[PDB]
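(Protein data)
===
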Amino acid sequence: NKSDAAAKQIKKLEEDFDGRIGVFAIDTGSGNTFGYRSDERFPLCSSFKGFLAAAVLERVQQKKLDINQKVKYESRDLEYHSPITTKYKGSGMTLGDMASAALQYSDNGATNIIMERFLGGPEGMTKFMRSIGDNEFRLDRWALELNTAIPGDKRDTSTPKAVANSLNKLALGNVLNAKVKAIYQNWLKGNTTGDARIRASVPADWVVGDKTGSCGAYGTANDYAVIWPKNRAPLIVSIYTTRKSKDDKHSDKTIAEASRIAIQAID
């Protein structure tokens, strides 16, 4: 009945702004879960960038890469929306700083440099996700090309549930060792783009780490988060949205509300 009430409220919210909301939330302490369209496909947009940063950290842990190695790109024509990589073009960036920039600022240069040199491209990114037992995630295209968010299109999608599961395994589980997991957590905690999304749905004193995604088409946007409430086990929240028309703008407030509803549902 608590599940069905949350479902009624997500359905209404999706009808109010004429779109589609997909939700998956986990209370990692009780194991209680809430899902709504949690098995349907949604565009990842930039949200995949948060898993790319984990892929890099896995490599670092395996000693295949060094977190301090200089990554140089002095001749590169930087993709649009490269606020961090554009400042360091002259001097380069450590692999660590570059990976976290991809996460924290959604930096496209950081994203594409890392996928071309370290991760084996979109197929490589997908392979990493298969390796943690995620069978839904697929990345098909590079940083600026995956934003088309065409209805029905399977490229560069996942499901809310698969996103949540993966984040749980990467942020809280055992894919990363203690030291490297802590780094990943701090990266997520210092994300800068998510203030109006999951972050806006919880009390100010709860600690949150997140990665957002905004397609810029079909009002498609999302957020996924690890949340450490005061004196309580962590939560995982995954919220994906699309809208009917190509020209519709995303709704931050819908995502925040969907999050509020999801958090109550597993309470």
